[PDB]
Design an enzyme around this catalytic site. Structure first.
Site, mmCIF file in Angstrom:
data_model
loop_
_atom_site.group_PDB
_atom_site.id
_atom_site.type_symbol
_atom_site.label_atom_id
_atom_site.label_comp_id
_atom_site.label_asym_id
_atom_site.label_seq_id
_atom_site.Cartn_x
_atom_site.Cartn_y
_atom_site.Cartn_z
ATOM 1 N N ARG A 111 0.758 -1.243 0.000
ATOM 2 C CA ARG A 111 0.000 0.000 0.000
ATOM 3 C C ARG A 111 0.789 1.295 0.000
ATOM 4 N NH1 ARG A 111 -4.319 -0.826 4.550
ATOM 5 N NH2 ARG A 111 -2.876 -2.420 5.303
ATOM 6 N N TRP A 280 2.553 -5.409 -8.818
ATOM 7 C CA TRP A 280 3.630 -6.386 -9.119
ATOM 8 C C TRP A 280 3.846 -7.371 -7.976
ATOM 9 C CZ3 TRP A 280 4.570 -0.982 -9.152
ATOM 10 C CH2 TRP A 280 5.162 -0.462 -7.993
HETATM 11 C C1 HEM Z 1 2.091 -2.649 -6.469
HETATM 12 C C2 HEM Z 1 2.603 -3.773 -5.995
HETATM 13 C C3 HEM Z 1 1.862 -4.558 -4.984
HETATM 14 C C4 HEM Z 1 2.436 -5.547 -4.098
HETATM 15 C C5 HEM Z 1 3.840 -6.052 -3.907
HETATM 16 C C6 HEM Z 1 1.218 -5.953 -3.388
HETATM 17 C C7 HEM Z 1 1.332 -7.004 -2.420
HETATM 18 C C8 HEM Z 1 0.211 -7.831 -2.019
HETATM 19 C C9 HEM Z 1 0.368 -9.151 -1.454
HETATM 20 C C10 HEM Z 1 1.638 -9.907 -1.280
HETATM 21 C C11 HEM Z 1 -0.978 -9.558 -1.007
HETATM 22 C C12 HEM Z 1 -1.364 -10.875 -0.360
HETATM 23 C C13 HEM Z 1 -1.711 -11.673 -1.593
HETATM 24 C C14 HEM Z 1 -2.138 -13.088 -1.259
HETATM 25 O O1 HEM Z 1 -1.450 -13.757 -0.473
HETATM 26 O O2 HEM Z 1 -3.162 -13.551 -1.794
HETATM 27 C C15 HEM Z 1 -1.876 -8.465 -1.391
HETATM 28 C C16 HEM Z 1 -3.317 -8.455 -1.098
HETATM 29 C C17 HEM Z 1 -4.195 -7.397 -1.602
HETATM 30 N N1 HEM Z 1 -3.765 -6.361 -2.378
HETATM 31 FE FE1 HEM Z 1 -1.837 -5.690 -2.827
HETATM 32 N N2 HEM Z 1 0.023 -5.416 -3.714
HETATM 33 C C18 HEM Z 1 0.402 -4.540 -4.661
HETATM 34 C C19 HEM Z 1 -0.548 -3.701 -5.394
HETATM 35 C C20 HEM Z 1 -1.979 -3.681 -5.221
HETATM 36 C C21 HEM Z 1 -2.894 -2.879 -6.061
HETATM 37 C C22 HEM Z 1 -2.556 -1.925 -7.237
HETATM 38 C C23 HEM Z 1 -4.208 -3.184 -5.444
HETATM 39 C C24 HEM Z 1 -5.550 -2.641 -5.839
HETATM 40 C C25 HEM Z 1 -5.623 -1.461 -6.466
HETATM 41 C C26 HEM Z 1 -4.007 -4.162 -4.358
HETATM 42 C C27 HEM Z 1 -5.058 -4.629 -3.432
HETATM 43 C C28 HEM Z 1 -4.928 -5.730 -2.571
HETATM 44 C C29 HEM Z 1 -6.182 -6.354 -2.086
HETATM 45 C C30 HEM Z 1 -7.640 -5.961 -2.245
HETATM 46 C C31 HEM Z 1 -5.654 -7.513 -1.387
HETATM 47 C C32 HEM Z 1 -6.456 -8.549 -0.605
HETATM 48 C C33 HEM Z 1 -6.524 -9.764 -1.445
HETATM 49 C C34 HEM Z 1 -7.484 -10.665 -0.787
HETATM 50 O O3 HEM Z 1 -8.059 -10.305 0.278
HETATM 51 O O4 HEM Z 1 -7.653 -11.743 -1.411
HETATM 52 N N3 HEM Z 1 -2.628 -4.582 -4.273
HETATM 53 N N4 HEM Z 1 -1.161 -7.396 -2.036
HETATM 54 N N1 LIG Z 2 1.315 -8.508 -5.855
HETATM 55 C C1 LIG Z 2 -0.021 -8.579 -5.623
HETATM 56 C C2 LIG Z 2 -0.837 -7.441 -5.574
HETATM 57 C C3 LIG Z 2 -2.204 -7.534 -5.256
HETATM 58 C C4 LIG Z 2 -2.777 -8.785 -5.004
HETATM 59 C C5 LIG Z 2 -4.150 -8.922 -4.691
HETATM 60 C C6 LIG Z 2 -4.663 -10.196 -4.467
HETATM 61 C C7 LIG Z 2 -3.845 -11.328 -4.573
HETATM 62 C C8 LIG Z 2 -4.350 -12.743 -4.431
HETATM 63 N N2 LIG Z 2 -5.428 -13.049 -3.552
HETATM 64 C C9 LIG Z 2 -5.870 -14.446 -3.698
HETATM 65 C C10 LIG Z 2 -6.822 -14.905 -2.585
HETATM 66 C C11 LIG Z 2 -7.281 -16.351 -2.837
HETATM 67 C C12 LIG Z 2 -8.228 -16.789 -1.732
HETATM 68 C C13 LIG Z 2 -8.557 -18.137 -1.572
HETATM 69 C C14 LIG Z 2 -9.440 -18.524 -0.562
HETATM 70 C C15 LIG Z 2 -9.989 -17.562 0.290
HETATM 71 C C16 LIG Z 2 -9.640 -16.216 0.133
HETATM 72 F F1 LIG Z 2 -10.137 -15.269 0.958
HETATM 73 C C17 LIG Z 2 -8.765 -15.831 -0.882
HETATM 74 C C18 LIG Z 2 -2.492 -11.208 -4.918
HETATM 75 C C19 LIG Z 2 -1.946 -9.917 -5.102
HETATM 76 N N3 LIG Z 2 -0.601 -9.786 -5.374
#
Ligand code: HEM
Ligand SMILES: Nc1ccc2ccc(CNCCCc3cccc(F)c3)cc2n1
Ligand code: HEM
Ligand SMILES: Nc1ccc2ccc(CNCCCc3cccc(F)c3)cc2n1
Ligand SMILES: C[C@H](O)[C@H](O)[C@H]1CNc2nc(N)[nH]c(=O)c2N1
Ligand SMILES: C[C@H](O)[C@H](O)[C@H]1CNc2nc(N)[nH]c(=O)c2N1
Ligand SMILES: [Zn+2]
Lengths: 411, 407
Positions: A111, A280
């Site tokens: 973020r 990314w």
């Molecule tokens: C720019 C580089 C970014 C990095 C390194 C990053 C990193 C991550 C990582 C490592 C997670 C956990 C993913 C998982 O284990 O499933 C995550 C979750 C999340 N990211 Fe970021 N992110 C980035 C950009 C963004 C952008 C541009 C958005 C939306 C505009 C975003 C919104 C979220 C949301 C909504 C989750 C929750 C996913 C979920 O609850 O399944 N990310 N992010």
């Molecule tokens: N580098 C990034 C940036 C943003 C991202 C947002 C979301 C995710 C992936 N979220 C996958 C969640 C899958 C899942 C399975 C079961 C339950 C649940 F809540 C979510 C990866 C990102 N990776």
């Protein structure tokens, strides 16, 4: 009510007041913590407070709160609600909306970057073919030859919930999974069901270990259609290790652009059910989870074999050993090919700085510890030692059920 | 109200009802989750006693028997007259075991019912407390074949007469901050160490000086005592492949024995109740050795391995962390001192969760503490949803006694 969080490595104590603006519920009560539970049509009735609150926030950010322009917009949205029962966001409010949903994403370690988000407004889109075009543009823009740029593409909002735009894929680019008659899986096990639907809709599956899936796209509540992303648009990185030469012979690659397409963006009560976004990768998403979860490519054994680890007792930590090497390889590969990636030390440190700045400027930063701490080497990242407060702000990104469970087929 | 927990790696789903018995509070609400914060009278006492005794008589399949009723009557008389009451040995043992069983942060709870309970409620002086403690140590150490045990000193009365062990663990290493400015020894104990010195201890001023016990009986000023060295089993830390490792000079003690917690049974508070089991390797190699504010040795180990420390993306920290942990487990095993690795401890806890769901209707678990501090997602607990809630009997934290006690 003021709430303190302590970092136990630094003794830095921060004070949360932002949680006071929190509306939605957490899942927890005074009697149960649900902090590790993965998942815990509106009327005019409920809509106008959601709009008002949203536009109060927007108009504050721009230092115009209480202005005539503020008031006229309220009255104008108001009239539009009772008249048409919904309302349209101006460009600027959409942008501000999409940024805030990212900023409020308590599970997101990336973020620090929330204010750099390229918003693509696809609210004039009407057809699946139109969606494909929008998606190809997003993917080319965001890829930018390896120098990845964050971006979001926003399709029309939900109306009666019968005309929904959806992207059926869980990510824009993701590999196929194929369950074999012997019970083994070929390619990514996480995508077997989705792969099966694509096949049913007429995709001819190459059936390899790394087949990029077709886009399956729903416009205006219609049945979805299949499209192939042009391969020249799909950036991929072969995985090798800086010292282990047999590593490349495992045949691994991954794609460079993480682009989540299955989430629901809520802004001022409006629901945008197709809002694919991309940033990314942090290296552990690929090297720990995608390669090493037991239900994913599960390469741990084969890597440890090749490393000639002692595999006869778990107390040799052969798994821990194999896992670090795989993660080294993933980062080496991406950096060698000049594709943006961030390792977990660097990403978590950035997040602590973001989080402290956010307490200083915003009065808080909702954060989900269970998600923010990386899935390897937890306590050697500064986030492990940071106390966090988890709570829900809007605008926000939310889950929604998979469209194949809810869609009414036209035929 | 009947809650589901899913394991995302196996799809196994378990139904929790045991949470409906929860008595104490979490720190969380509908609006804010506090899951990652480390620390969020006659009339009072009778319900507490009643609730405890009802579960005790249910556990021995005697719910609603004369004996059940009579004990309730008897404890009730004792409360009304004495304003407190005494546990029967059987209830004491049951309560202690259950406090462990309900410790939502403990991964080792598959072991909960093999707990040796030493009743020290007849203790009256620090010298006595010292004797009890030495006996506990020697029993639990068992020449490296470690056995779980707890020793229970007399219960709080009017809170002017508390028994406290001031140490955080019975066995821990000293901490001296330097003129030079850094820290010799364990920086977590720097303050306790000066309380000892400013109470009389002669410190050898080494890196690994076993601390002296500081024991408080009946609310008196506390007194120093050296544990006979012969009772302190320590392991020299070497690596099964890096010869230079032994020259880092690292050792750790075999007996983890938390002594600063408060054991609450049926409304009764046992403020001195040191207990001990055995180590999961990561506690020493990840946390003790590598925490920035602990022995913090990753920098030195990475050098010896000649890793590229130029940039965080070489994962040199992660590489060194693994080797440090290989070495801890290797040393303990070689010396035949009980230790468990995180893979094996977390696999056991999943099976324990299974048992407790089917036998008890669930198992409070704090995901943030249970998931090891290295290799999270390659251990099965990472993928396991857990519900966290507070059952009694329990262990609770309590103020450090130097902030409370009066001289
Ligand atoms: C720019 C580089 C970014 C990095 C390194 C990053 C990193 C991550 C990582 C490592 C997670 C956990 C993913 C998982 O284990 O499933 C995550 C979750 C999340 N990211 Fe970021 N992110 C980035 C950009 C963004 C952008 C541009 C958005 C939306 C505009 C975003 C919104 C979220 C949301 C909504 C989750 C929750 C996913 C979920 O609850 O399944 N990310 N992010
Ligand atoms: N580098 C990034 C940036 C943003 C991202 C947002 C979301 C995710 C992936 N979220 C996958 C969640 C899958 C899942 C399975 C079961 C339950 C649940 F809540 C979510 C990866 C990102 N990776
Ligand atoms: C038998 C071997 C045991 C293993 C491997 C084990 C494992 C652990 C581990 C790894 C922790 C986290 C410790 C930390 O990070 O500070 C822990 C916490 C805990 N354990 Fe166990 N344990 C064992 C025995 C016991 C026994 C015998 C009791 C009590 C009778 C107990 C009660 C607790 C309590 C109360 C906590 C958390 C205390 C707190 O909240 O700080 N443990 N245990
Ligand atoms: N192998 C074992 C068995 C039982 C154990 C019980 C407790 C501990 C140690 N807990 C210490 C936590 C110290 C602390 C400081 C600040 C805040 C806070 F919540 C806890 C280790 C164990 N290790
Ligand atoms: C049950 C548990 O909450 C689940 O495994 C979570 C844990 N933490 C996570 N953290 C991230 N970033 N991504 C995940 O998928 C998960 N899975
Ligand atoms: C901030 C966070 O609550 C704190 O660092 C926790 C995280 N998880 C932990 N887990 C265990 N087992 N032990 C700990 O001391 C901690 N510390
Ligand atoms: Zn909670």
């Amino acid at each position: 009510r003021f709430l303190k969080v302590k970092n136990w490595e630094t003794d830095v104590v921060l004070t949360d007041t932002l949680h006071l603006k929190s509306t939605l519920e957490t899942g927890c009560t005074e009697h149960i913590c649900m902090g590790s539970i993965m998942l815990p049509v509106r009327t005019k009735d409920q809509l106008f407070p959601l709009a008002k609150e949203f536009l109060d926030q927007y108009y504050s950010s721009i230092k115009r709160f209480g202005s005539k322009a503020h008031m006229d917009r309220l009255e104008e949205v108001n009239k539009e609600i009772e008249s048409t029962s919904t309302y349209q966001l101006k460009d600027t409010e959409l942008i501000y909306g999409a940024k805030h949903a990212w900023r409020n994403a308590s599970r997101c370690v990336g973020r620090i970057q929330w204010s750099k988000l390229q918003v693509f407004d696809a609210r004039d889109c009407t057809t699946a073919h139109g969606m494909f075009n929008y998606i190809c543009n997003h993917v080319k823009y965001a890829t930018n030859k390896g120098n990845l740029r964050s971006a979001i593409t926003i399709f029309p909002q939900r109306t009666d919930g019968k005309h929904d735009f959806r992207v059926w894929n869980s990510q824009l680019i993701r590999y196929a999974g194929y369950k074999q008659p012997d019970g083994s899986t070929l390619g990514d096990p996480a995508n077997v069901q989705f792969t099966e639907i694509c096949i049913q809709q007429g995709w001819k599956a190459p059936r390899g270990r790394f087949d990029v899936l077709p886009l399956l796209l729903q416009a205006n509540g219609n049945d979805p259609e299949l499209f192939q992303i042009p391969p020249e648009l799909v950036l991929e990185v072969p995985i090798r290790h800086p010292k282990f030469d047999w590593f490349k012979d495992l045949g691994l690659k991954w794609y460079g652009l993480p682009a989540v397409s299955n989430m629901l963006l809520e802004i001022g009560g409006l629901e945008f059910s197709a809002c694919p976004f991309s940033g990314w990768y942090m290296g552990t998403e690929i090297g720990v989870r995608d390669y090493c979860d037991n239900s994913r490519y599960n390469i741990l054994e084969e890597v440890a074999k090749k490393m000639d680890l002692d595999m006869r007792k778990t107390s040799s930590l052969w798994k821990d050993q194999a896992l670090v090497e795989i993660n080294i390889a993933v980062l080496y590969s991406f950096q060698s090919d000049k594709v943006t990636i961030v390792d977990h030390h660097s990403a978590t440190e950035s997040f602590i700085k973001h989080m402290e700045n956010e307490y200083r400027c915003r009065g808080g930063c909702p954060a989900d510890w269970v998600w923010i701490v990386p899935p390897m080497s937890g306590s050697i990242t500064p986030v492990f030692h940071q106390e966090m407060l988890n709570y829900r702000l809007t605008p926000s990104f939310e889950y929604q059920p998979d469209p194949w469970n809810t869609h009414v087929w036209k035929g």
